[PDB]
Design a protein around this nucleic acid. Structure first.
Lengths: 22, 436
DNA sequence: TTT
């Protein structure tokens, strides 16, 4: 699981639509 | 008086070169080598001896303070001193009024943070200096290579390569164990990440499912709506990544969805020119420089009629009108600016500036083309950004307490900007550095 | 990608 490409995209999309504000 | 060899070597080589006539000097001491420390001895020794004409400079407005607050003698931007060249370069044109001692009557010329100079600024500098103003710089050769959009050459500032500017390098770090220094020392050698936890005030990152949640809930714990966030910093590569970040930060710090709120402190992105017309010839006075921090006073979303000569109809521009007051140490001025906070409508102002070109690219419907209202309209607006989230390129020359980082936007950065992005990316937070 |  050396996917530094995908793992950077998992963090990229979670910034795109961040969690419902609290 | 007693330091490592480099500091014992650098001070003399500087003096033996400027007491002598012709040598040009730059010093390259990277993180840990105490360059900010070594610059001081160069100053306090010289003000005690009979060597006059000592003038200090800075490439930006941020670095000006941290020197004039470090030394005790007034500093200035490298532009303000050398016959100010504004955001678009020029010569011999004075905008500010400070009776600035930029008389070019100087045996010594000092400028720090030499990691930002393009060719355009060095050539003006050489054409400016008298035959007796020796240049002594000090900086970091592994920080971000200067931004030159007009050269495919990925080149660092010329203050290292130039012939006369034969530079000495500092090499040995002294603080026998610093978690940050031990990081940025390997990152300049291209390893780019690891975790080191010592004494709880150090560097550590976040991964996994709740990568950003735990990282954000760490941010908002460090700064719980404190409204005092000058020392807690998030830093990113792109402009797309940033405008997401300060939006998230704001909605928790300043509870609202407005892009701007009253009483908020914002950082500029252009010098606000206050331009007067005298006898038919333009003049200018700078009110707020580029990096100058300022506060909001009154907020309102409005519209404006935009128009240019030779162009049909009227165009619809919707922007902010915000009064602004000066913040920090600078002199107190109060005037107002125009800012558009809509990517949806930022395009609508570009097309006016777009379709106008064709008219002026050939306006033969009588004599010469009237290029006035092109720049007269474009100089109405400005660019700004929030304080909590600034980009990697613009977050330099100022060291903060606790730092934050965002990695995913750095794939598009090449191999050589990467290490210069992380070197400056880690080195900003003095004690604590958190990444992702 | 960058000011």
């Amino acid at each position: 699981a050396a996917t530094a490409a995908k793992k950077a995209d998992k963090v990229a999309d979670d910034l795109d639509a961040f969690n419902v504000d609290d | 008086d007693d330091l490592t060899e480099g500091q014992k070597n650098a001070f003399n080589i500087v003096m033996k070169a400027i007491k002598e006539k012709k040598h040009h000097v730059t010093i390259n001491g990277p993180a840990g080598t105490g360059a900010t420390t070594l610059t001081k001895f160069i100053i306090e020794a010289l003000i005690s001896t009979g060597e006059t004409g000592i003038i200090l400079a800075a490439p930006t407005h941020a670095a000006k303070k941290i020197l004039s607050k470090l030394s005790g003698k007034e500093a200035s931007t490298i532009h303000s001193i050398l016959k100010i060249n504004p955001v678009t370069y020029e010569e011999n044109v004075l905008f500010e009024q400070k009776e600035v001692p930029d008389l070019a009557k100087c045996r010594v010329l000092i400028c720090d943070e030499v990691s930002m100079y393009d060719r355009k600024l060095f050539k003006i500098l050489l054409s400016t200096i008298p035959p007796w103003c020796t240049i002594i710089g000090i900086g970091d050769n592994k920080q971000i290579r200067p931004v030159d959009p007009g050269e495919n050459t990925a080149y660092i500032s010329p203050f290292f390569t130039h012939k006369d500017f034969y530079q000495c390098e500092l090499t040995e770090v002294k603080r026998s164990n610093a978690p940050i220094i031990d990081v940025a020392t390997d990152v300049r050698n291209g390893k780019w990440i690891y975790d080191k936890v010592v004494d709880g005030h150090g560097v550590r990152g976040f991964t996994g499912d709740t990568a950003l949640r735990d990282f954000m809930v760490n941010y908002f714990s460090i700064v719980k709506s404190l409204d005092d966030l000058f020392e807690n910093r998030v830093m990113a590569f792109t402009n797309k990544s940033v405008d997401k970040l300060n939006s998230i930060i704001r909605k928790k710090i300043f509870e609202t969805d407005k892009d701007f709120i009253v009483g908020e402190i914002i950082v500029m992105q252009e010098p606000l020119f206050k331009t007067y017309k005298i006898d038919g010839k333009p003049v200018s006075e700078i009110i707020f420089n580029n990096g100058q921090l300022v506060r909001i006073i009154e907020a309102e979303y409005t519209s404006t009629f935009v128009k240019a000569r030779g162009v049909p109809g009227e165009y619809l521009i919707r922007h902010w009108d915000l009064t602004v007051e000066t913040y920090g140490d600078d002199e107190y001025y109060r005037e107002k600016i125009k800012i558009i906070s809509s990517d949806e409508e930022l395009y609508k102002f570009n097309l006016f500036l777009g379709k106008t070109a064709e008219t002026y690219k050939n306006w033969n419907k009588g004599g010469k083309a009237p290029w006035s209202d092109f720049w007269d309209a474009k100089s109405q607006f400005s660019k700004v950004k929030a304080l909590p989230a600034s980009t990697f390129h613009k977050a330099q020359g100022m060291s903060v307490d606790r730092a934050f980082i965002y990695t995913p936007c750095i794939h598009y950065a090449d191999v050589e900007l990467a290490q210069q992005l992380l070197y400056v990316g880690v080195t900003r937070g003095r004690y604590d550095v958190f990444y992702v």
